[PDB]
Design a protein around this ligand. Structure first.
Ligand code: 8LW
Length: 114
């Protein structure tokens, strides 16, 4: 029965995550930060996250509520604004994703509370 309720949540979160990825047309956040390109990344960042990793979790009914999903979105953003300096294409992409994504998530919070 929980999974019946949770099936509806998934559907809504799928749509939210699609909208979020559209706010990253550079695909900067679409997969794990490459450890080939950034061999020291896990020394800096203890909990990596990216949209593909969210999508896996989503499709395994791994998000039991919207807050768990927003936590992983926030990890993408916060990890990026820690690792990268402010003038970089990465930090600026994180700011735009945070700003544009917040609009999407504020509407999502309303639809969940229904
Ligand atoms: C290369 C890289 C470094 C990143 C970073 C993302 C990338 N990066 C990839 O690792 C990558 C892997 C595979 C395909 C890709 C396609 C487009 C862009 C990236 C990409 C990308 O920016 N983020 C979010 C960071 O904070 N850093 C330091």
């Amino acid at each position: 029965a929980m999974e019946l309720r949770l099936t509806e949540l998934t559907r809504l979160l799928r749509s939210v995550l699609d909208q979020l990825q559209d706010k990253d047309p550079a695909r900067i956040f679409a997969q794990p930060v490459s450890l080939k390109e950034v061999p020291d990344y896990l020394d800096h960042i203890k909990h990596p996250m990216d949209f593909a990793t969210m999508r896996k979790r989503l499709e395994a009914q791994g998000y039991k509520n919207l807050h768990e999903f927003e936590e992983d979105f926030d990890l993408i953003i916060d990890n990026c604004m820690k690792y990268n300096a402010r003038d970089t294409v990465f930090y600026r992409a994180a700011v735009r994703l945070r700003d544009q994504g917040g609009v999407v998530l504020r509407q999502a919070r309303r639809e969940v509370d229904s």
